[model samples]
Target: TLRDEINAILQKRIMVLDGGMGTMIQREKLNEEHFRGQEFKDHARPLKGNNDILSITQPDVIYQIHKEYLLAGADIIETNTFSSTSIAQADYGLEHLAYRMNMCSAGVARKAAEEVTLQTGIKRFVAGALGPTNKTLSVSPSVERPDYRNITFDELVEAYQEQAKGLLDGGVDILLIETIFDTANAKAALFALQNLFEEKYAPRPIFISGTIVDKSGRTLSGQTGEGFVISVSHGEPLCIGLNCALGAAEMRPFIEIIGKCTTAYVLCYPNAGLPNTFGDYDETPSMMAKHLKDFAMDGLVNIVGGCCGSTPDHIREIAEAVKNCKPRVPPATAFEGHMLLSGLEPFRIGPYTNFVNIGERCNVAGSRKFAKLIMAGNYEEALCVAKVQVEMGAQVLDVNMDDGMLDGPSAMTRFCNLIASEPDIAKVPLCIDSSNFAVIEAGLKCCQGKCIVNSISLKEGEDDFLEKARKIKKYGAAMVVMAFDEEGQATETDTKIRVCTRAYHLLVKKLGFNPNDIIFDPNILTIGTGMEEHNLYAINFIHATKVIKETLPGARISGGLSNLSFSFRGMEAIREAMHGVFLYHAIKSGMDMGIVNAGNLPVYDDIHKELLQLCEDLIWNKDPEATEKLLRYAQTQG
Candidate 1:
């Protein structure tokens, strides 16, 4: 059981935990603003309230809070040092007192924990509190620093290190890194503690957690839960999952999701509920007990506790509710959602890769020789185009082998046969890209995997086209959707988003295609021409990416990643750069796989590698095993 693991790791029978810090702090001399400053001040509100119940400033109150929780049933008393690290104390210009304050803070929890656990044999663990230090994402190059932060990464690490040592010095049983965001900071905490542990040899279990943000499944700083699994790779976790941000009801889904990714004992301490009119944590014990019951029943959680406004009553109720709760295997929810990517973090994604318009050496789009040869019905040149794209990492080579000037049928059939004749070609999936229905149906018959039919628009009176796409979707093949209802194309950002959303609903709800199987393009526009160019309304490329990603998170995306850079100076570099940047933002916004030329400008390839690393790091945190496996994969490919 979770209690056994905690006891074994902590060298104790039962782990006693402390009660609220901010709430306890409010009873001290910190002033009303002390409780009101968290986010209320931003709305022109003043800090004139009492402690929000478990704040850090009032150890005296926290002492009482711990005493009460212990009386109710807590064996572990967490220090009133949720922000005890120098990085956090630096905010108050008390960076110098980090050691003293953390020591003192740990003393309070240690004092309380000992008081309860010693007499009762409950063995209260002095949990050293460590929450988020700063909110900025270290992975992004384009972050805007908030007005509050003045320190850097090294500074933060040293601060947390100092705090951890002080807490250990004060007899903290384990360091609880609570609700921390930014994988870099989590890495910093692990790195610092690992090195310090080696030198000090002070025994302490470290528990790590990430704060869930919105329905997007990313951290407040943009890392995903799987990202947390990767970030803590350099060190080890005693228990890992989530806490805070969410309340009892909301946290379950995220925990159920996170638990699917790691075998580590998961810890969840969601807030009581959303706060009350006075910002009071008012989750009733019954409410909390109900959620804990679910957590225990599903066996998705190991250590379930309370954060924010949890009271002694809350604990008592949860203990009772969980006393006889049965355990069962948790279903897989982590991989259920559309996995997105942010920097190096990889979210859950569909199991397909797109390799359309790979720009082969034989393609006429660039090479005049091939284009002329293709238009002249020179089957050999078209075959060469097919040969090269397939060789250069095309998983699903799009058969655009178009000769608009000739008999498209025979030419396509001949090109398809030549493509079919190749040994490797049959192995790779083929995306049929053409408007000629006969040619598409014929080629689809020969493609390896049930391929994605290039596209059909929602053009006015195009019900027949929509039916075909729906029909194609039914054949175990993905379908491409265009956001135009026969009358015209979606001309604005909202229209594009609406169309994409509509397409997603129609394909999944109507045609029964897995949302992952449908791909949509927001149709990137160029700043080189049309009314869109003069007014800076160029197809809203970035926003478009964000919308489609945000709206249809599980779906794939297509179209030219370079549409924004058309005719611009250094178009190649911009297109390549945009491919990474656009795709990066899209992942953040929540799109899955994308189609882009992997070989062209160094930027695209570089970003792709970086993106992969970011995902691996987010998932595996550069663990030795994952790194070695990646190296092996590279060598195997080589």
Candidate 2:
């Protein structure tokens, strides 16, 4: 009765119901000699003049009849007064008692549903019966057979109104006014119910229908299911369709037609079939199961069941088969969405540590040439390196293991162990680098510091071997990404950047590593082969480097120290001199970090120092901090 609570249920799951009471009653073989003779003459002749549906003739039969179907798990128990309305009752010379019979029959059905719900602890419902007036509604344009000719739409409305109020008052859950022999009667019945509700309760999900004569798509009066669907559906009933007249075999196709046309649930309860020679309808439960099974899986009908000769066992079988059946799933919008990881920033960038150049290079990269002098890795070399880099404005230190070139993972671990013992390297975190992945892994496995993977590259020429490098990158490597692929060097600058972008995405999107952690190398090319494109290549490389930077400024830009001047001879000084200029221009252009021949004093002293200072003067206007911080440091570069 909590309207909102009930609507919540309705919105979540469509309400379904079991079918008719009269059909089920006919199966049970009711004791109704008096009703057949007194009311329905055709059915009364069957049991030697016994027709039970004339049940309102003895309204007590109403209680027992519906209660059995309800006990058998009927969610909806239709009423006993199908033929007791004014139009039908007038035939039995009992039209005067039409109001009394309609009220009494619905009251019986209501009590049956309530009692069944309480006893079984399951919800049950009643549908007030309002079948076709059977008055043919054939206006002959003459008042000769005026019951047919003169029953105006208003009279039909008044008749259904009495039935509706009685059922509503008696607590019927819905009004099932149907088997409408005429569309006009169906329309009239809907009008009556809505009018009776004062339009308040919404006609309570009414189900209305007309008789389907054959698979010809027509009513008993020859209107097709299509034309029938169009005419009476405007009555505002929750559903409108054919019932009773069409057998179960024929109902399916027409029902499907009804399903396509209407938004409302298309109800169908057909006769077992046309009756036998004895005028006996013998559609068994098995036969009924076959017909109902087809659409049992369809979502077209909100509820389904049988009509004329359908038995409770027929319903039982249909219900059992359909109990867990579900319509095909539509798609998933099932409340899905994306969630950003709640904790950390995407990438953390800082530190200009490259340990190879200065072996006193933070004593961070384990170099035995220097490690022996330091005694189980002493802090003096480590601290001295840290202080100088910190003084040179280095934000991060490159800690690596070049252990014996053969000492392997364990050696790297030993290096990590030695370095970690020092408070200096731990605080200014180290980038754990070792050619031996096992060493890198073993070293990093126990290090309690955040670090970067010194490198990975497509230029490496094969995927499997290098993929391990990217893997470690994912496990917290602020990656130093090299440019070589598995195949070979990228000869063109754009191809090189494409490789870089791929490597960059593998980390950011694929490996889930942060973008800022990546450092790309449009690697400085060699000059040993008299390649004249050095300056041109450098410009292209730096421009490509700029694209990488603009696309991802957080990614670090780095290169090998000797690469720019690796094999161009005698002009070694020119190469060095050009290296110094390129380094300055590159920095002005956007190089953030690199390794270098740190011990080459004059190159560091003369060219690197002078070029940086001059470049500083040009771009940044010789600002005080720029001169003091960058220029002063350039003074002792190599």
Candidate 3:
């Protein structure tokens, strides 16, 4: 396969990619007649500036552009299909022609590459370009309603599937997802390609190139350089890079960051320069080449090229400048032992990190105010709940819409879409919490960042558990595995360890799940329910946490903290102190995170001495008299 061939070449030399296809097409000076061609002369909408259509309307012109780049020493040429997606072509009223445009475009580039390879005895490759479409999945289109989206994830996937099928059938060696301003849009493209490769054809090498919008070193959708890399690493790209928005001089910092964080081959192709007042690039070929050459000398890139306003001259100059420089070597410990997650910024969990607080206020099942807003369809105000949680220092927000009266999937989707528009709330990772797999999937599809699925278990048996795990893996999410199986939910300490151990083995050893991504939740059942049987619930969970952490290697432990104080409901003072005391011990027992309202958690050291000791006694199951003492205190408070 070409992927293997390219991998071998990359080990020894830096490869050069072709310059801007749009720039070369603009030089043709064609009119509407050239764009419409004899085939589409009678079509309704204007197609004068649709460069992608020129592959079919004027094949000779597109072929000439590819030949010029190949002659200028380009090892890789991109097909003229950047905006050939059906969703993008819909603007020109030519949605039906998207597949044909991609197929024709790929053939034109392939012909040029083959002819040049045979004539010069130098190999050349074709990368089928998949551009980010006009509609964004992460950002809302309407200012009046931040919850409303113009496109759905499934729509993007279907459109990209049609485009990918055309490119694959036309014999392109690689699929290049480039100029990506939104990571959600890129995920849809990757998901579509993965589906095609698994069900239809063989997999091809995937190259992802995101554009840094400005000096902030973040994408237009607000992902930091490290966050962007972590968000898209799930696709397992062959090469990752930065392209288009900034000039080479301005792109160096971001390129350096990506090179240092990923094990994949790092490639960079910046613009000629920042656009001038007239919206034209100003840097000359020599000027741009010098900037790119500096990147190579610093060992920051394996492949280099040009973007907007660059021509064959620029490609030729860049090829000559880096001919002797060695390709960048990927870092050996780039992703070791880290559970990498993200929203707009990256969040990492390693061995020494403190307890992660996943805010519970956003969950409809837990918060009455949020539930009322969601039930009334007051999503705009409901966003405030999510925002407040973040402001209160919640590292991750747990979102749930599992009411009996609501459409779980639709509600989850709508809420997530709205949340994406609020930068303050969307800045942290999310936990898509729901009992139904369909609802969980709907939320996962809407989220671009790496989130947590709240959870999967063996209650329905191993087949059902594995199937959900597989889907969650494809969507690039960590999972909370419950201590439950076909027999029932684990209640006693022995039962909890047995269930967690079994699930852990199946996930890590059999399915090859990264242990860092598996979070074990031994059930935190209520203990002060006046039943002697309930006395050991908290103690059992603490014991199980110690055992799971010791036996499961890289796995983490978490639980619903509020559940521990369920028996003392409405006794805010007692409940609050009880939670703090339980967390104090649980953290010491190796619990890594918990779901709770971040705003109301009491400081463990601030609890009154009498109340603190009573809570501790109940949590540790230290004495038979401890429960009665706690019960008497709770009654007095009431």
Candidate 3 per-residue C-alpha lDDT over 1-638 given as tens digits, one digit per residue, 9 for 90 to 100: 87899999998989999888888888889999999989889988899999999998899999999999999989999999989998999889989988899999999999999999999999999998999999999887778867788899999999999999999999999899999988999999989998999897999999999999999888988888898898998898999989987988789889999898899999899989978998788999999888888988999999999898899999999999999998888887886888888998889988878888999988788788889998998987888888888899799999999889899999999989888888888879999999999999999999979999996899999999988998898888899999999999899889999999999899876688878899999999998887888899998999999999888888899899998898877788888998999888889999999998787888899999999999988888887888689878877763
Candidate 2 matches the true fold with a TM-score of 0.45
Candidate 3 residues lying further than 4 Å off, grouped into runs, are none
Q: Clash pairs of candidate 3?
A: none
Better of 1 and 3 by TM-score: 3
lDDT of 2 at 449: 34
TM-score computed on alpha carbons, candidate 1: 0.50
Please provide, for model 2 over 356-469, each residue's C-alpha lDDT reduced to its tens digit, 9 standing for 90 to 100: 231225332434445553445443454555556544544455555554534555545545444434443333445555555666665544443345556556644446534775
The candidate, 1 or 2, that scores higher on TM-score is: 1
Sequence-dependent TM-score of model 3: 0.98
lDDT of model 3 at position 186: 93
Q: How do all models score by TM-score?
A: 0.50, 0.45, 0.98
